[PDB]
Design an enzyme around this catalytic site. Sequence first.
Site, short mmCIF file in Angstrom:
data_model
loop_
_atom_site.label_atom_id
_atom_site.label_comp_id
_atom_site.label_asym_id
_atom_site.label_seq_id
_atom_site.Cartn_x
_atom_site.Cartn_y
_atom_site.Cartn_z
N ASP A 152 35.82 -9.71 5.78
CA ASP A 152 36.46 -8.46 5.38
C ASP A 152 35.92 -8.01 4.03
O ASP A 152 35.28 -8.79 3.29
CB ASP A 152 37.97 -8.64 5.23
N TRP A 186 37.05 -15.07 10.08
CA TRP A 186 37.11 -15.58 11.42
C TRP A 186 35.73 -15.43 12.02
O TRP A 186 34.92 -14.64 11.51
CB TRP A 186 38.24 -14.93 12.23
C1 LIG Z 1 41.57 -8.43 9.39
O1 LIG Z 1 41.57 -9.24 8.18
C2 LIG Z 1 42.83 -8.74 10.21
C3 LIG Z 1 44.17 -8.43 9.53
C4 LIG Z 1 45.34 -8.87 10.15
C5 LIG Z 1 46.60 -8.63 9.59
C6 LIG Z 1 46.70 -8.00 8.38
C7 LIG Z 1 45.54 -7.55 7.72
C8 LIG Z 1 44.29 -7.78 8.30
#
Ligand SMILES: *[C@H](O)Cc1ccccc1
EC number: 1.4.9.2
Lengths: 122, 121, 359, 361
Positions: free
Chosen positions: A70, A51
């Site tokens: 991530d 994002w």
């Molecule tokens: C970061 O990737 C946000 C997120 C949201 C839900 C589950 C795992 C990570």
Amino acid sequence: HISLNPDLANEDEVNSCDYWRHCAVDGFLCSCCGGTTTTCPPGSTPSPISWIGTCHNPHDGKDYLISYHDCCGKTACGRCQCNTQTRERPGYEFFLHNDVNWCMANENSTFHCTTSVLVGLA
Amino acid sequence: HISLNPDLANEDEVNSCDYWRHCAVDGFLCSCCGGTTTTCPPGSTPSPISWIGTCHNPHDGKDYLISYHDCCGKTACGRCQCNTQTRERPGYEFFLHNDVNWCMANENSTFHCTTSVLVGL
Amino acid sequence: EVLTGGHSVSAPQENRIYVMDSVFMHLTESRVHVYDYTNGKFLGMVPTAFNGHVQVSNDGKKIYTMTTYHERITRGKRSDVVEVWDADKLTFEKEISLPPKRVQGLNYDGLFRQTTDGKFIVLQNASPATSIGIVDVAKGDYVEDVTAAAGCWSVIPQPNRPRSFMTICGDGGLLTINLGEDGKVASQSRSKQMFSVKDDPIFIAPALDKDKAHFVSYYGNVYSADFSGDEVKVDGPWSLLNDEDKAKNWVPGGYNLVGLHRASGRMYVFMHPDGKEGTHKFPAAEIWVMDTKTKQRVARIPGRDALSMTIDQQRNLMLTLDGGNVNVYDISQPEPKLLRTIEGAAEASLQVQFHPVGG
Amino acid sequence: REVLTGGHSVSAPQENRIYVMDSVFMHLTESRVHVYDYTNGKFLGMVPTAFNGHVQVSNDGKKIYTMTTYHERITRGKRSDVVEVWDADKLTFEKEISLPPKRVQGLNYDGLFRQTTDGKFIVLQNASPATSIGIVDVAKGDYVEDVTAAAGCWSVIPQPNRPRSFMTICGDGGLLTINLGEDGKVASQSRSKQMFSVKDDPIFIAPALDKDKAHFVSYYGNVYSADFSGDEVKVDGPWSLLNDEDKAKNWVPGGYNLVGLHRASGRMYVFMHPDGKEGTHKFPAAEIWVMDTKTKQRVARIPGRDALSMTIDQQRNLMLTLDGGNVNVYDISQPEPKLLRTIEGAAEASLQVQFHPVGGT
Ligand SMILES: *[C@H](O)Cc1ccccc1
Ligand SMILES: *[C@H](O)Cc1ccccc1
């Protein structure tokens, strides 16, 4: 500017959810997880997708595009959890949305930590 | 009578680590997990093996053998964790030892909760 | 004494609620916690591996989960699945294979839904390209992939049709999909633009009536989608806010943040003051109760830092959830009355649901 | 401007590293090892270890060994018990070694997952619930076979003066010594005389391990020893940790990995608490006592910080203690330990911490 180079900053400053570039993080800051702002902790894999956020830098007065990549393939780091939402939008603006796992397309989608990669001026 | 039948007793009493028959529990009390002292929560499987405790009943003054059978095949219940060690011994007296997962021989060994089954005097 | 298994949940279905615990700190051990809302008793649980989603079948007989496994958790081959569980025995019955793109994300209702008739599970995919997947429950098969929904997000079932649902698209309108009895797309339509994506983004959570849905916006406006006909008619905005409200910058915030009481038309919304960019997921300072017919607020009560809610129509109840604790409210009258708080229902939950009683 | 990269090594050198085995008992299927820098409390990384992982570092310091259990669908499906070999510097998975589906599931005592002094074999405890010791040839990546001779015994105490020998504590109150051949099979074995009364003076399994002897403390604060300097083990004890004042206040040991030996000085470290009675053997430490094992006298006593487990580094003269969540770092170069720092929040539920090995040949 010094405010663009987290590796030169005090660790406590960069490891805070209030650090200016972490303005749309939903996750554990990788810099608290054995990595740095731009390097995954050992044995975790960068996500090729992310994002994106626009964050204001109060130190130089300019707005910057941030890509929240991530690190993946290890279980939850658990440290420095943030849930900041500046300019974050729902899933119908999918790449502005942070309630989805941006590890979702990795070889292993287990979410480890998040970070804020500086792309450039907004 | 009443001290030997937890289903009739007060739930807050039975769901406490100080309840007399829980004297060697290392785990989550199944009675806090949707089960009872002698029944597994729905969808969790009894262990055929157990560690054993000798617990003192403060109502009738007698000691009883308690078999600590686990319920298995679901992830950790997380409620009413106890770590009581009356008459517990290390793994060289293996069936008196409670630092091992008594679900270890089940079809699925994931540990859910621990029950306190009254064997007898 | 002898330890036995094979037991059913000890409280009647009508007492049961489902708290979806993401366990974000240990997201590979997410689970559903089953509680009795009448007394706060823990009744059981269903394990849901990595970032599980959950719903109960509309007929009340089965629990459906959606999750991801890997052969060695953090390595090995991925399996995305729907699982069917018995609702009374809390036992696994069937695995349904999905393509490896089921949505991984926080537990908004609209990511994992079902048709009104209960015959099809309707779920959101992201690869990150989006599409909607259809599972035939009876056949235990993934039967359709709705690529027409690319660039859209979330599933809003139409309660007045057996196999119809809508999704919110990147144009600010809605895509309606009507499934055939085989679970394949039978027809579709696109509404006119309902909201400006850029200027007044809506929260995806619907306040869902039998024949219409209301949505609230980041700035406290309300939009509606009326599906009394085959073509969805869209309208809005009207503001949740009066002039006093505006002076203190009240705006909505939360996750599953709205609900509708269908008999009265009351809409419930989590609100907080001092709204500005970035506050759309803030915990509730208040719950506002809006009359959707008059487009005016009727009541406001303390929010107890809640983030998500759900409504039971037939018992006139609202649950709210702050991440860990569930509050039970009577909403038989316009002012909700707090009945009890179930503390420690989850470590990290953004979704609670009632066991269906409506058939 | 920037690009996120992986492939990186742990930022601090090996000699700074410790491993906190987090059982995460509340979510035991997501246990993991947390890697910390003991010199400054910095979190360095982690190794995921699925359900109830155990961990050790290879004697040569190059690899991390884990032991765990998987199932195809976690709570259902086929079981796979494994040892995994991970690179220590990259914290990456390298190899899985299949075990029979009976590896010990239980709390993280050191003696459940060990290795021969020469580093060639991993030596692990099985329980089906019948007990046996499993031998893994690391380089071959093979499970050799079950040491069925160890039935009714528990835990693995390597003999640091021999390349591929270890002992286990048996239900008769004696020790069984196993000597492996170069293939990892049992070449010979021997059984000691009774060391302790299982009924009257049960010992904690955790050894205070010297190069050629091991000491053990009992539930009642006695000390036993097993001397393996000769070809057969010679056993002795009890001698008491307690003086009259200590006995009058019912001081006894308590904890899990509750003892340690500083080999160069002969100082033994033990967690102790007052008001001992049946059921207090896993109580947190009110104090740490430091015993001279030659003179059989206490030389120091300091606050316990509610510690349950410890480990000693012979090469830097350090003791770590662990209360379940926090790690205390002590300098033990003098008889009275000195507290250097506490690492808060190192784990949610850990009963085992270990140093990355330095030297030790
Ligand atoms: C970061 O990737 C946000 C997120 C949201 C839900 C589950 C795992 C990570
Ligand atoms: C109850 O079976 C005790 C236990 C110990 C260690 C792991 C899991 C369960």
